[PDB]
Design a protein around this ligand. Structure first.
Ligand SMILES: *[C@@](O)(c1ncc(-c2ccccn2)o1)[C@H]1CCc2cc(Oc3ccccc3)ccc2C1
Ligand SMILES: *[C@@](O)(c1ncc(-c2ccccn2)o1)[C@H]1CCc2cc(Oc3ccccc3)ccc2C1
Ligand SMILES: [Cl-]
Lengths: 547, 542
């Protein structure tokens, strides 16, 4: 019984095809009216300068919108990042509040951000042909700030993946190399922004979904503290799981864009539309601070062996920060294997994967999901038995499998309490070293298509911060050299299990691909996190800022 | 099998007795050295005036400390609200930060606020002889603000109660009438502050534990949004339940004291000590605003029939607010039975009470807890069958029973998502009426001792706001008249089940007892909630 799944894919593909055709027509209509417009100059303007020219009236919102729309349509040809054109955006463009902080800015949205009249399929047949009836809160706030949300971008099926394919819209490809994943689950956003088709987008992240596509595609991304921004109207395939906090955040070409997006979102409109969000205004003085920092750092988490490019990106950033007067302090959050295997894995799959699996009933399982669905469908007794068998040779595989078993509400409370204690334990470590921020490696270079689903272990660098619920962002700092890439032949991983074997092959053939570092601060310290990211970007890529 | 429990009770009573003797000795010594001090004038000073005189140097921290210590010792005689004297407070007194916003202010703490070298028993044998290694975060912040925490105050055993007795320290009594409950679980705080033994205290609330004792004892109390203040170091008996968040907040004689306490607590010190707390400073401009309000209100929640005094208190407050230029809008949060029976009950007892029951193994069960332990101990199939049988005649009893059953993590996720959606539902309902605030009845007058445990349904007025996680505070507005009390004889309740029958009897003989109203604002709007409470206070107690 795959006719239901086939029908949904046929309809989704027709809608995506019609969307792209509508974009093409609007772009051609505009271009014939504006032949002298310097499109390349407008497309390469950093967001801050684009916003200033829109606010002064130097650039019209139409020129900006239609030029980006044309670029999005062009880059989509080689990336397949766009699932839907938000058709009513041209009416929003004419009504954009003039004094809005993002006036005339086209914004791309990950498919899960509910947008009136459009599906949020998550690549699942069960959600095809069920359009949203209202804009989610952050979309309402973007519009109230004069921004023009224009496209829905692709996600891997269900979003529980750092790849970017689903049976409805297909596979999104990295704009730097077609054989590579753009990362995920905000992969469509990573590919679109990374190829210049959008100056700003929004993604979501429970295990690294903003950070993986930002790093793989060579753009900046911030995952705030879970409750810094409204999650009201965000479509997900599992609800009520609170142990591992989901967060939403900006993705863009530079750090200043992330800070402007955060400043525009953290306004009275957001706080009144969603009173559950603490009304914490963006602290400009914290973001703009030039005071020296006490930077904790690690070159490896001893769980996922860093690629030679990751290790060099980290070491070089560390050295530039030291030369700039910051204090670099070795720091490693305690019990990383326990935080990932017991707390994160157990938090995400407390019910054995039953709630998640309901979404796949009668659907195709995208190959980019690997054996995740097959593994989760196993009876609890069998996950326990197979875990006992795997334990002596492959303890990491045994530990994940054992922690993907269903449990009682009593055991969930115990797990939730352990998450709270673990959070305080890392805060205590941080305080004992008097850190301001933390610098870590970020997974990269981009993995080959269809390999993220077979290298689960590699979520270690990002997922730890969803478990801890700390703001964490990524900044591109270097590109893979042939030297770094040849060095992948000596890569063994710490465990030598299937995930390490996959990761070794998957990170090969990555010359010229972007590589990032991750910047972290304590809960509610997004402005300090961004101040540090701004520092990293300035020291490693000085051209990206006013020079 | 109660030897361990008996020994814990003997040692607790010894320590309580020795604490009170230490207090008396310190008080008599100070009084001998300062016989000219006007103790009555000092004690009657409203907290803000007390703070001003302490800041200027008109009153010494020593004078304020020992005067309040003596009063606390005296009021404890008829209330039994003090479990422990925080010994080292005389050392804190001399070292109190001079520029602190609470410089020299004696503060009472509910027993669950961990204090270095003291037990936080919660009235449980298992917690006796387990002294805290350190002060909890809020206690550290109070001290950094120059306050002087001086006593631990009594709680009902486990704190899952709105009465105030445990088998270790015994029963706390209302200072207005010894046969009455001081409310709970922050009962010791209510009885102490309510009788003038402390100008400021801290309590905690998951189902009304700040609000019940403040209302029952005729004092002000505020339960903020769960995560407005740090819960780091708070002693609890159930951990990891996050469906219904616990909140902590101030208790005091007036609204201004609550606003000062919040202002003092919402400082860089708290935010640095506990980074998990959003760094929201006290918004003085919102608290000080005097703009006309759109006040939603209800005379009844259609769940707990209000006592005639509760209804009168609500109507009079509504009328005074309208006369002062506010807009009073009829408003009742939708689906209150579901919020209480399914979300609140289910959220508190998702595991069928197994984690809670662990605490009572080998212990006595205080009579004030009623049948809560016996009911939670029932096997799941039995709670189910008993609920099915009760459903046709007593649907309220049947609904609470079925929702006190254990469940899977899958079902807990579903319940957690239902709590989030219900919160958005009431927020949407509130915004459709363009409310600023909400005025509700507040359970009162004080129930007789050992009756809260047999009147579960009466948590409806308060527990609704724990489920919704909205800031909610209480203000005394009137006292029970002969007429209010006579009309209570005609009280029926909406269900006619055991909980409504008990409430009528439990509220008998209440002439002169204080009655409150409850003020609610949206999440994180503590400043607005207090601005509204100040308004009620100005109108009802001019
Ligand atoms: C992203 O962080 C992501 N994007 C959206 C969501 C999400 C999840 C739940 C509810 C709403 N939204 O998450 C993904 C990063 C990669 C990833 C990988 C895994 O893999 C996995 C399998 C087994 C055990 C541990 C981890 C799961 C989830 C994600 C989230
Ligand atoms: C208080 O709100 C209170 N005080 C401390 C705590 C607490 C709870 C859990 C963890 C840490 N602290 O709560 C009490 C108000 C009255 C009350 C009543 C009931 O009764 C009940 C029985 C069956 C079903 C629903 C409610 C339970 C809890 C409380 C909390
Ligand atoms: Cl929060």
């Amino acid at each position: 019984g795959r006719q239901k799944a086939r029908g949904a894919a046929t309809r989704a593909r027709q809608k995506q095809r019609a969307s792209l055709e509508t974009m093409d027509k609007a772009v051609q209509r505009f271009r014939l009216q504006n032949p002298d417009l310097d499109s390349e100059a407008l497309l390469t303007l950093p967001l801050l300068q684009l916003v200033q020219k829109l606010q002064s009236g130097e650039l019209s919102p139409e020129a900006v919108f239609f030029t980006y729309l044309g670029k999005a349509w062009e880059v989509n040809k080689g990336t397949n990042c766009v699932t839907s054109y938000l058709t009513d955006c041209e009416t929003q463009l004419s009504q954009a509040p003039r004094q809005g902080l993002l006036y005339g800015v086209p914004v791309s949205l990950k498919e899960c951000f509910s947008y009136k009249g459009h599906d949020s399929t998550l690549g699942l047949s069960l959600n095809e042909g069920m359009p949203s009836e209202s804009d989610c809160v952050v979309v309402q706030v973007l519009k109230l700030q004069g921004a023009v949300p224009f496209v829905h971008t692709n996600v891997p099926q269900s979003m529980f993946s750092y790849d970017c394919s689903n049976p409805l819209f297909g596979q999104t490809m990295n704009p730097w190399k077609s054989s590579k994943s753009p990362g995920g689950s905000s992969g469509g956003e990573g590919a679109l922004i990374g190829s210049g088709g959008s100056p700003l987008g929004l993604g979501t992240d429970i295990g690294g979904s903003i950070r993986f596509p930002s790093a793989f595609c060579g753009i900046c991304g911030l995952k705030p503290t879970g409750n810094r921004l409204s999650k009201s109207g965000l479509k997900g395939c599992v609800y009520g799981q609170t142990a591992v906090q989901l967060s939403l955040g900006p993705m863009a070409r530079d750090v200043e864009s992330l800070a402007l997006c955060l400043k525009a979102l953290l306004c009275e409109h957001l706080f009144t539309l969603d009173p559950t969000v603490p009304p914490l205004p963006f602290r400009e003085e914290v973001y703009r601070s030039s005071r020296p920092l006490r930077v904790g750092y690690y070159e490896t988490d001893n769980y996922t062996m860093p690629s030679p490019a990751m290790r060099r990106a980290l070491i070089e950033t560390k050295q530039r920060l030291e030369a700039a007067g910051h204090t670099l302090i070795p720091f490693l959050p305690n019990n990383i294997p326990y935080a990932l295997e017991v707390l994160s894995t157990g938090g995400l799959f407390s019910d054995g994967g039953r709630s998640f699996l309901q979404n796949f009933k009668g659907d195709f399982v995208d190959p980019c999901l690997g054996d995740l669905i097959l593994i989760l469908r196993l009876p609890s007794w069998f996950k326990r038995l197979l875990s006992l068998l795997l334990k002596p040779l492959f303890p990491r595989l045994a530990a994940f499998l054992n922690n993907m078993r269903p449990r009682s509400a009593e055991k969930l409370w115990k797990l939730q309490h352990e998450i709270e204690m673990y959070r305080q334990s890392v805060i205590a470590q941080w305080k004992a070293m008097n850190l301001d921020v933390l610098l870590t490696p970020m997974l990269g270079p981009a993995l080959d298509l269809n390999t993220p689903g077979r290298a689960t272990g590699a979520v270690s660098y990002t997922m730890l911060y969803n478990c801890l619920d700390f703001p964490a962002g990524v900044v591109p700092v270097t590109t893979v050299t042939a030297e770094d890439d040849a060095q992948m032949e000596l890569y063994k991983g710490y465990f030598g299990d299937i995930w390490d074997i996959i990761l070794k092959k998957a990170m090969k053939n990555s010359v010229g691909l972007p590589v990032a570092v991750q910047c972290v601060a304590l809960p509610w310290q997004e402005e300090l996190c961004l101040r540090f990211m701004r520092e990293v970007e300035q020291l490693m890529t000085p051209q990206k800022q006013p020079s």
